[PDB]
Amino acid sequence: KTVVVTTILESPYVMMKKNHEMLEGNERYEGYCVDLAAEIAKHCGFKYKLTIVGDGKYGARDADTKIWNGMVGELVYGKADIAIAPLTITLVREEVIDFSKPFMSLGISIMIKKGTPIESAEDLSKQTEIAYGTLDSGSTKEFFRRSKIAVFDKMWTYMRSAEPSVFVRTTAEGVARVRKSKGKYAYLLESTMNEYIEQRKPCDTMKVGGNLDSKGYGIATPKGSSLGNAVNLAVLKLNEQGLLDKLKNKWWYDKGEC
Amino acid sequence: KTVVVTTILESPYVMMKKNHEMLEGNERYEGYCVDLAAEIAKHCGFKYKLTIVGDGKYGARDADTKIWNGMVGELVYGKADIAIAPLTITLVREEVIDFSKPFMSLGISIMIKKGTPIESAEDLSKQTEIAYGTLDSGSTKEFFRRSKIAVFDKMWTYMRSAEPSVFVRTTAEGVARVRKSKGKYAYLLESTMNEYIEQRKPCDTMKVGGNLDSKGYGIATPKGSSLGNAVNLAVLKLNEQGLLDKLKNKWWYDKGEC
Ligand SMILES: [Zn+2]
Ligand SMILES: [Zn+2]
Ligand SMILES: [Zn+2]
């Protein structure tokens, strides 16, 4: 049986190639997770089909219906066999799906236009002249919603009732908002993404301060999957071979344009 | 039944309290892992007994005899029920015991005596006046032994044949060797340990260069253990609640001497 891989279009993890119109199947995509999927498939010895998650979300549970959406949902409901993407390993998700050991370590970070008078999370929480927000349906937003840390909770009370919404639907929208806000909007996002964008022209953003937390991205499989065990060992093997470090260089700095 | 916890005497993870002779049981020890053990036990709801691994090793399989030593061996042979220590998550170990998601992220790093003209692994590899080695019997030594990367293999070729041995029995031994080397010996060890020592008197060592790799420490249990699932969720919950960050600040910087 061909393994159905659910993923998400998020640069530089998964992106359509420039000449995709003349390509088919998995050949239409390129990126860190596309190379990773190939590596895993080869090691676990299976054929696969990359599919972009329907609703374009990572995964959250509807408070009222208790229904899971995003990639997590595709696994939970059996629409996908494995998820290979920048999916954060979290307690609530671990309760419903399986995660391999992390293939990438990261943390929440701050993205500023450039020249913006902000160097830390505290700086943001001290003023209101500069707005800030996060992605939606993600682990970053939830981080602030649940944080008991004085500063982070103070940052959440603002973001929650912020008018208009400081939250964005996709990373691209957040980065776009930062760039066109004359430095009046700071974006909170996962460090790996921050670092990638900082190397992308117009080269007008920069990551500031240390990460607010420490987390990891993991490959996910549904509970009781015959793939989980093998995939977990594959990730460890790949990290130990240095392949994972090889891949980040390739997609983050070898292609940097700043 | 009371859970038997195996751990190792490695500062600041586990250390005998100054007046341990006056105390009994678990109260005899203090440290990052002692604090972590208490929390994991509370959240998982079990009583435990801390025990220092008999042979003072982390865990390796002897080729030929096929016997596992160290903390890994105690889990494999059923002498301990869980290992709470700076035990590196590795593929070979993952094949015989279970690991929770990492509670700490780190990488191999370089420790020099302040003033040593070394800034990278490449630097070490391209010279010979300054000797260098690693802890013996651990994941750091194995990283070099198994590495297929040019720089690191070149480093391993030197270390494995150096005489007298550049390997050390304990971290304290490696650090003391660096301190009395007059800059003629550099020590390769895990980043978190390097960072800790850099904050201890006489304040004569320093971490240089970026980490050579990326990995993490995890709580280990025997395969098929009844505690596995709960311990894993506890680690994720404790990280998400910020405890892990609080603990590292407590044992690394709050008590810094430099
Ligand atoms: Zn490979
Ligand atoms: Zn709803
Ligand atoms: Zn607690």
Cβ-in-10-Å burial (0-12, 13-18, 19+) of A252 comes to middle
> What method was applied to determine this entry?
X-ray
Please, which residues have CB within 8 angstroms of residue B180's CB and are 6 or more apart in sequence? none
CB < 8 Å to A240, chain B: 90-91, 143, 146
Of A98, A56, A55, the residue nearest A75 (C-alpha): A98
Q: Is the distance from CB of A31 to CB of A14 less than 8 angstroms?
A: yes
Of B167, B138, B165, the residue nearest B69 (C-alpha): B138
CB < 8 Å to A89, chain B: 101, 236
Does residue A148 belong to the interface with chain B, where contact is any CB pair within 8 Å?
A: yes
CB < 8 Å to B105, chain A: 105, 214, 216
3-state secondary structure of B187: strand
Please, which residues have CB within 8 angstroms of residue A214's CB and are 6 or more apart in sequence? A105, A106, A107, B105, B239, B244, B245
DSSP state of B217: E
Measured from the Cβ of residue B230, the count of other Cβ atoms closer than 10 Å reads 17
Using the structure block, give the residue that is written with the tokens 């013996």. Answer: B136
Q: Is the distance from CB of A11 to CB of A196 less than 8 angstroms?
A: yes
Q: Distances in Å between the alpha carbon of B54 and those of B8, B9, B15, B80?
A: 9, 11, 15, 11
| Chain A nearest-CA residue for B142 | A240
What stretch of H or E contains B139? helix B139-146
Of B244, B224, B238, the residue nearest B98 (C-alpha): B224
Q: Distances in Å between the alpha carbon of A206 and those of A119, A199, A254, B86?
A: 10, 9, 18, 34
DSSP state of B116: -
Q: Report d(CA A157, CA A160) in Å as an integer.
A: 5
What pairing do the DSSP bridges indicate for beta strands A48-52 and A3-7?
A: parallel
CB < 8 Å to A213, chain B: 239, 242, 245
Of B213, B205, B209, the residue nearest B258 (C-alpha): B205
| Token digits of residue B138 | 């651990």
- Say how many Å lie between the CA of residue A234 and the centre of ligand 1: 9
In a 13 Å sphere around the CA of B177, the CA atoms on its Cβ side amount to 24
Please, which residues have CB within 8 angstroms of residue A243's CB and are 6 or more apart in sequence? A39
* CATH 3.40.190.10 intervals, chain A: 1-106+216-255, 107-215
Q: Report d(CA A47, CA A42) in Å as an integer.
A: 8
Which residues face A97 on adjacent strands?
A222
Q: Report d(CA A102, CA A232) in Å as an integer.
A: 9
Query: Which of A89, A94, A238 is the best residue to mutate to test the B interface, defined by the most B CB atoms within 10 Å of its own CB?
Result: A94
Measured from the Cβ of residue B221, the count of other Cβ atoms closer than 10 Å reads 24
In a 13 Å sphere around the CA of A181, the CA atoms on its Cβ side amount to 24
Is the domain covering B107-215 a CATH 3.40.640.10 domain? no
Interface of B with A in 201-240 (CB under 8 A): 213-216, 218, 232-233, 236-237, 239-240
Q: Report d(CA B156, CA B150) in Å as an integer.
A: 10
Does residue B90 belong to the interface with chain A, where contact is any CB pair within 8 Å?
A: yes
3-state secondary structure of B198: coil
Q: Report d(CA B134, CA B162) in Å as an integer.
A: 12
- Say how many Å lie between the CA of residue B4 and the centre of ligand 3: 20
- Say how many Å lie between the CA of residue A43 and the centre of ligand 1: 7
Measured from the Cβ of residue A189, the count of other Cβ atoms closer than 10 Å reads 24
Sheet holding A108-112, edge to edge: A131-133, A185-190, A108-112, A206-208
Query: Which listed CATH number (3.30.980.10, 3.40.50.300, 3.10.520.10, 3.40.190.10) goes with B1-106+216-255?
Result: 3.40.190.10
Q: Distances in Å between the alpha carbon of A92 and those of B61, B76, B230?
A: 36, 30, 13
Of B12, B14, B11, B40, the residue nearest B28 (C-alpha): B14
| Chain A nearest-CA residue for B239 | A214
What stretch of H or E contains B244? helix B243-248
How far is CA A25 from its chain centroid? Answer: 23
- B91/chain A closest Cα distance in angstroms: 6
| Token digits of residue B22 | 């006056």
CB < 8 Å to B237, chain A: 91
Q: Report d(CA A85, CA A100) in Å as an integer.
A: 12
- Label each residue of chain A as H, E or C: CCEEEEECCECCCEEECCCHHHCCHHHHEECHHHHHHHHHHHHHCCCEEEEECCCCCCCCECCCCCCECHHHHHHHCCCCCEECCCCECCHHHHCCEEECCCCEEECEEEEECCCCCCCCHHHHHHCCCCEEECECCCHHHHHHHHCCCHHHHHHHHHHHHCCCCCCECCHHHHHHHHHHCCCCEEEEEEHHHHHHHHCCCCCCCEEECCCCCCEEECCEEECCCCCHHHHHHHHHHHHHHCHHHHHHHHHHCCCCCC
Q: Report d(CA B245, CA B103) in Å as an integer.
A: 10
